[PDB]
Amino acid sequence: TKPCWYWDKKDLAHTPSQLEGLDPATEARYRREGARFIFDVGTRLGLHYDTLATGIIYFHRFYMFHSFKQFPRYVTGACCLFLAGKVEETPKKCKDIIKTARSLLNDVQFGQFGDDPKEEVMVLERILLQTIKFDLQVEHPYQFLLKYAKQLKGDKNKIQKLVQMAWTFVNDSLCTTLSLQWEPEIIAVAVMYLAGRLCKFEIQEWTSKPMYRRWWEQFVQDVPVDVLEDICHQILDLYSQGKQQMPH
Amino acid sequence: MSYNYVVTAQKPTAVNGCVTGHFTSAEDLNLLIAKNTRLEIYVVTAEGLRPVKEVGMYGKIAVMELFRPKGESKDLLFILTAKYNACILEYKQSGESIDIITRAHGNVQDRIGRPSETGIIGIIDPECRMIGLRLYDGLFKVIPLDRDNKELKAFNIRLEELHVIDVKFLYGCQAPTICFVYQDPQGRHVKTYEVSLREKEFNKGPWKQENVEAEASMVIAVPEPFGGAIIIGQESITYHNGDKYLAIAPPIIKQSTIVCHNRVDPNGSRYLLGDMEGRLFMLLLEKEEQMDGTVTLKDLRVELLGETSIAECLTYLDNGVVFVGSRLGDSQLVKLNVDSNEQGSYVVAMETFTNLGPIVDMCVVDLERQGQGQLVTCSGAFKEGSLRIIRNGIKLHIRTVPLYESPRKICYQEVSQCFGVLSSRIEVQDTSGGTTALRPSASTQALSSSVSSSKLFSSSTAPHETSFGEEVEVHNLLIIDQHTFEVLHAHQFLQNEYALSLVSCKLGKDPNTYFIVGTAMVYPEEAEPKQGRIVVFQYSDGKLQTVAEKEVKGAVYSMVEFNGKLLASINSTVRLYEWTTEKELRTECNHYNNIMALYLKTKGDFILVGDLMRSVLLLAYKPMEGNFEEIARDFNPNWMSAVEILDDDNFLGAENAFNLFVCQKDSAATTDEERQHLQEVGLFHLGEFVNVFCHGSLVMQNLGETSTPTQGSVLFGTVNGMIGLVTSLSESWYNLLLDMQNRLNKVIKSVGKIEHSFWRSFHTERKTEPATGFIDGDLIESFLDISRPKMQEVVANLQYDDGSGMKREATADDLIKVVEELTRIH
Amino acid sequence: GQTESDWGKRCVDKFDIIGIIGEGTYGQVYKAKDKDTGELVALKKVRLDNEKEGFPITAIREIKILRQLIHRSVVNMKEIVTDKQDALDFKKDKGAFYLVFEYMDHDLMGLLESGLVHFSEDHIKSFMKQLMEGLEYCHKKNFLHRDIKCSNILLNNSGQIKLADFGLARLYNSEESRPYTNKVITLWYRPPELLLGEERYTPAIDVWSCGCILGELFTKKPIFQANLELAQLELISRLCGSPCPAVWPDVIKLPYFNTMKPKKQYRRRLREEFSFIPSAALDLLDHMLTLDPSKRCTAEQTLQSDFLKDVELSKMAPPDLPHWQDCHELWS
Numbered sequence A: 001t002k003p004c005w006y007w008d009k010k011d012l013a014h015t016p017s018q019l020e021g022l023d024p025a026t027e028a029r030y031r032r033e034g035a036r037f038i039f040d041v042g043t044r045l046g047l048h049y050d051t052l053a054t055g056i057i058y059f060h061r062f063y064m065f066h067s068f069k070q071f072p073r074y075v076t077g078a079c080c081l082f083l084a085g086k087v088e089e090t091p092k093k094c095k096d097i098i099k100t101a102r103s104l105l106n107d108v109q110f111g112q113f114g115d116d117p118k119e120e121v122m123v124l125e126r127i128l129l130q131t132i133k134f135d136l137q138v139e140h141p142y143q144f145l146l147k148y149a150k151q152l153k154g155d156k157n158k159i160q161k162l163v164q165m166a167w168t169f170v171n172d173s174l175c176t177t178l179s180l181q182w183e184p185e186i187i188a189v190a191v192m193y194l195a196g197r198l199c200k201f202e203i204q205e206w207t208s209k210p211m212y213r214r215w216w217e218q219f220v221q222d223v224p225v226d227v228l229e230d231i232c233h234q235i236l237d238l239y240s241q242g243k244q245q246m247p248h
Numbered sequence B: 001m002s003y004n005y006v007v008t009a010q011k012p013t014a015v016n017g018c019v020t021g022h023f024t025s026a027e028d029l030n031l032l033i034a035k036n037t038r039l040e041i042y043v044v045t046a047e048g049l050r051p052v053k054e055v056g057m058y059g060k061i062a063v064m065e066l067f068r069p070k071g072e073s074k075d076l077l078f079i080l081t082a083k084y085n086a087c088i089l090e091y092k093q094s095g096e097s098i099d100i101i102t103r104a105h106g107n108v109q110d111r112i113g114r115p116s117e118t119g120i121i122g123i124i125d126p127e128c129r130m131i132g133l134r135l136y137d138g139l140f141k142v143i144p145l146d147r148d149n150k151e152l153k154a155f156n157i158r159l160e161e162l163h164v165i166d167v168k169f170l171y172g173c174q175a176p177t178i179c180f181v182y183q184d185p186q187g188r189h190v191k192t193y194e195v196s197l198r199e200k201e202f203n204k205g206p207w208k209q210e211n212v213e214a215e216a217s218m219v220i221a222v223p224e225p226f227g228g229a230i231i232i233g234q235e236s237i238t239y240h241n242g243d244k245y246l247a248i249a250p251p252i253i254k255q256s257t258i259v260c261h262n263r264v265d266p267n268g269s270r271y272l273l274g275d276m277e278g279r280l281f282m283l284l285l286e287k288e289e290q291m292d293g294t295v296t297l298k299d300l301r302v303e304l305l306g307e308t309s310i311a312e313c314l315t316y317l318d319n320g321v322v323f324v325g326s327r328l329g330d331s332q333l334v335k336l337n338v339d340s341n342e343q344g345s346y347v348v349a350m351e352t353f354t355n356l357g358p359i360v361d362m363c364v365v366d367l368e369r370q371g372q373g374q375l376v377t378c379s380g381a382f383k384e385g386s387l388r389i390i391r392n393g394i395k396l397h398i399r400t401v402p403l404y405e406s407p408r409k410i411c412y413q414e415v416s417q418c419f420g421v422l423s424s425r426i427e428v429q430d431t432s433g434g435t436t437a438l439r440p441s442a443s444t445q446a447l448s449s450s451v452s453s454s455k456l457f458s459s460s461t462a463p464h465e466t467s468f469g470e471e472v473e474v475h476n477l478l479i480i481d482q483h484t485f486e487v488l489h490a491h492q493f494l495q496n497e498y499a500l501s502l503v504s505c506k507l508g509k510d511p512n513t514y515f516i517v518g519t520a521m522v523y524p525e526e527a528e529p530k531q532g533r534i535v536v537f538q539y540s541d542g543k544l545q546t547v548a549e550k551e552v553k554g555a556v557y558s559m560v561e562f563n564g565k566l567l568a569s570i571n572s573t574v575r576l577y578e579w580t581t582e583k584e585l586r587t588e589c590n591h592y593n594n595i596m597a598l599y600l601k602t603k604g605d606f607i608l609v610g611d612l613m614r615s616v617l618l619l620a621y622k623p624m625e626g627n628f629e630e631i632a633r634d635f636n637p638n639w640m641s642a643v644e645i646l647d648d649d650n651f652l653g654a655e656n657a658f659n660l661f662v663c664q665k666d667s668a669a670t671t672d673e674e675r676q677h678l679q680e681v682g683l684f685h686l687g688e689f690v691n692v693f694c695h696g697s698l699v700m701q702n703l704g705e706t707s708t709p710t711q712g713s714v715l716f717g718t719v720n721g722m723i724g725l726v727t728s729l730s731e732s733w734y735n736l737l738l739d740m741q742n743r744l745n746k747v748i749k750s751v752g753k754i755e756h757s758f759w760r761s762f763h764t765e766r767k768t769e770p771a772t773g774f775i776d777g778d779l780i781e782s783f784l785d786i787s788r789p790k791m792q793e794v795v796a797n798l799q800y801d802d803g804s805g806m807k808r809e810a811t812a813d814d815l816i817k818v819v820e821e822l823t824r825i826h
Numbered sequence C: 001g002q003t004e005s006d007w008g009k010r011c012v013d014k015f016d017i018i019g020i021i022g023e024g025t026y027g028q029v030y031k032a033k034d035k036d037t038g039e040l041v042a043l044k045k046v047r048l049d050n051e052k053e054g055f056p057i058t059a060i061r062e063i064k065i066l067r068q069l070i071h072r073s074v075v076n077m078k079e080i081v082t083d084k085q086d087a088l089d090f091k092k093d094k095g096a097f098y099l100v101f102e103y104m105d106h107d108l109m110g111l112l113e114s115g116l117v118h119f120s121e122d123h124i125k126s127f128m129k130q131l132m133e134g135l136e137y138c139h140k141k142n143f144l145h146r147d148i149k150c151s152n153i154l155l156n157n158s159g160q161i162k163l164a165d166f167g168l169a170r171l172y173n174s175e176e177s178r179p180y181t182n183k184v185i186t187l188w189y190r191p192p193e194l195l196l197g198e199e200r201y202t203p204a205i206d207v208w209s210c211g212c213i214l215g216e217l218f219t220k221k222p223i224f225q226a227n228l229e230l231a232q233l234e235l236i237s238r239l240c241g242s243p244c245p246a247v248w249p250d251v252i253k254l255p256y257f258n259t260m261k262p263k264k265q266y267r268r269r270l271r272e273e274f275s276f277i278p279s280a281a282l283d284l285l286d287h288m289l290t291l292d293p294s295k296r297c298t299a300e301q302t303l304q305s306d307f308l309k310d311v312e313l314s315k316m317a318p319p320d321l322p323h324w325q326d327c328h329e330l331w332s
């Protein structure tokens, strides 16, 4: 019916980028660069948050089938955001995205677009649609983070601090391969799980089963704690690596 | 009964080992490079290497180590050959005459013992107290380094652990201590023992055994400052010393297997590592020193420096240069820079040493109708794969055509002014479900390209499952121009299809000249391939067209043109196809009495079959009946590597034990049993692994008939890059040249005092026989280098066949003319 | 009737000769395929042309001895075929006879001499138990093969072992002491009693040869390799100890005892030089290579050993033969 868009962590060592000589650190860097590029460009254009993530997920899935060396990262990222705009019904003209790209890219980085930046992007749309198998509908952990928080009852200010901090973790998780590792529902629970430990919150108390120590089960079934700890470990790797500190 | 003559045209070029030390003098830093049976002595300078001496040894150099005992001015050299000849050598220079002195010599072969799996290992104690040899399973041989042990006598200490992977003499131990990784059914472990020359037995080792990686490869003796050892594996590098245990597991080294190592800093702070993909790593040893009372290892680090040639041995010299000794490609001198280049690599190549590497196939072609002839070889493997064009140069001129993939078989088609080359590249299962190549090669960078659209195997109910990270071989047929050597076209065969044989010829009454490839469907579940294709191509107007396909039930290991019919070997079957007027192949007759019909040669209606076992078979196509007929077979079992037809009665073959032999039909006897018995009449230990025999010669060919002492010309290429020549002699010339060998052997002093007859003696693990029917031409051509007093010793009492019908004694100058005429065959 | 009861009446025309495979005891061995059944069979020729003594007596022995022997580990002579029978007059027939054996896949010689095969401990147990079960059967029937060599040891790809050539086979009787030919086993497998000139020998001559094969499966190299009988006795003395009246009381009776003296009076170094062999097999090898044939173990005693007593023939662990695409050139 629908294609599978999820791999295992061990499979990332065999991406077309890895197999062409790129080291694991460079592909992860190229992914964060492309993710933040799609994030910053669409933010400058005033785009909805679902449109940003949809293009980022298109971007992440694209370089599971192709190599970063053969397709320029910033040329591909612009095409994903352009397609994501028409997909999520928040469209922008291709010339408007190119204009924003020149603002945020230096002379070296913008050279990927070649002599005709618009044509290099419009051309890549055919390969993008074929690579993503025309599976345009993509859901994101944001709607699940909100669907689960409404079922929480208690201190409104404590729950609101939990949501924004988890929402920050979802924005940061876009820079990672987590979008490909796990379904969006599990990611929304893991960011609740991480923000609960940092904020010292007992999330089980706000649920309909205040005693259910596995508070996550009432939201997403069949989720071991090993997965939640694994996702939390990946998100916090960005904070310790970069210059940003944990929200807390 | 048969008489042959073998000379070396090109010395072995593949570097089998390389070491750094102080052999010539205590001040100079020498780089002793070891190729097969050859020892090169160089002097390291600021500009590169300065040659000083090159010597030949009567044995395949297996172990080569430099040591300096107490009281010696410069380092001495210890060498153990493949035939277990051990010796200790010293450098002596009297002005311009440089000679190598054999201080000690002996044979350390045991009468009873199972040869180990990981090969001969040679280690020397840091205190130079003993030489440690691992020659057999469960046995550790110790040669005590006493000043009077000139015969190199040795005793064996029983070893509990039978299956050992690698062993080294440890540093920083009170008593001489060995550290080894062994493999038992409980995995692999590392253990230690103390060697006692007084007791001649093992004592308990310093630190205990621990369970290590299942693919533990090498042991690295960390020097005195850090102490202990480092164990290299496939995914983890571990350091063990006393109670200290360290384990690093970087994700980069999992991609390719590490095979070699070398120390940069003598204190052991920095180490070199190399992969199968040419990647170069650096192993860093962090120090924790506090008034020197600790100097323990804080942590270990590995960093990727760049890409070198696939090296068998690495050695760091001085001024930042490293010699990359390669067996699969060209050896190089590389510069290690502190600065990364524009690509992020810290390695820059200084010089390139041409290495013919593995010569898998080769063909002699007179491209320029000069009468000289050129040899185009398939050389190298993986990234070092290339084509080499060799010609006589008025030394030798070799042109390299890099392919960046493994070449397989080569054939020339003058009708298209191009070559046919079978090649294979390695791609890895990516995340998209398909495969992605690591590097571009000739099959991908072809001008035009095509892929076989055959459905001959249809679904063959075999949709094997592929997991991510599994290597796959992609076989292609390359069309290469004869002038530019540009990849004109590349035909990619079916999935999981290996290209094994390649021929260019016309068939039947069809005037078009075709390229024919024999293939096989290779799956890991199959012990012997049960599917295959014989496909016929026609190269016309720069594009290859699929003419016809024939399905076979096995592997097409070899094909050859037989009187306009195609003779092909399919697994145990040797089949003859006919080229019908419908442009399709049709089976005529079969032969089945084989195990694995590998190498094929034909001459008229005669057929020489080279099987995996037992040896060589003669098949004759009988046109009256239309079926094959066995004439005679060599009944002594041999593992064949290449066969060749010398004449209608002599046959030449090469076995996996580095031995050449010559069979002959028992004349035309009256008994049916005598005729059917191919008798081995020639035996000779070559020392090289022959892959391809080829008729031809690179010397100028004079259509004028000249009564030359040699008749015929057969060239062969080897794994170590050595190219030789085989030719037949008359009985008068054989006895004349053979008598010179016995005179030359008594005169010439060999390195390590190795008997020449012992070296050239036919040698397998089970039988050892003296050489017969072969004249070591490398020994005969050395007559032009011995001093004049030694020439008179050779020509003394020697009776020649001067003129016509007279047995007059030869002058020494008469022998110089004979050898100089034999030097003109190459 | 039928069922291979009537012999000599079938002709060799029913067999198509594939080719010659090797040299046998008295004549060379050829391989063929039956036209009717399609089975691969091994044939061996008997001339019968020598009107000196007519039918060869060494062939009569192999025909007489082999028709009595039936075992899973012994090559069974299938039938006997003849050449074309000339005319109505039995006087004009100069045709020869052919012995029809069962054809096996490989020979131990070709497998070991090529160096391709590898024998694990479980393979040697499957090998030696079948080898000793067949030898025990023939020794119980009082027959001596006297030519135990790797060329007469045949193997199928299933793992079944069979002994082949019985042309040099004779009958043994302990009561009747009849002199036989002193030199009969290949020098590398000849027992020390035969080197010293024993003409009336025991069935332990095959036990010594098979003992040299047992050790040959662990080293893949023959133990004692010499070109002369005295040099062969020296290699045996360097390992098993010099033949002396202390360990061999009946050595003095042997004629060449004073003639063929070893270099030294060596001590037994068999367990020392074979320390890498498993303990179960070293005890078996030590007894099989015992100098005194009266102290040498029998075929039944080898089957009652920790190395072979509990081995099951249902497994038949076949010896590893190399495959292909991972061999030659740089492949693996």
Ligand SMILES: Cn1cc(-n2cnc3c(NCc4nc5cc(Cl)c(Cl)cc5[nH]4)nc(N4CCOCC4)nc32)cn1
Pocket (backbone or CB within 6 Å): B593, B594, B614, B633, B634, B635, C019, C020, C021, C022, C023, C024, C029, C031, C042, C044, C075, C101, C102, C103, C104, C105, C106, C107, C109, C110, C151, C154, C164, C165, C166
């Ligand atoms: C008395 N007797 C013999 C058999 N007997 C059955 N099977 C074989 C067999 N099968 C392997 C084999 N080796 C071959 C070599 C060649 Cl060159 C060819 Cl073409 C085909 C081959 N097949 N070998 C032999 N040997 C006889 C003597 O010397 C060497 C081997 N005897 C065999 C049955 N009774």
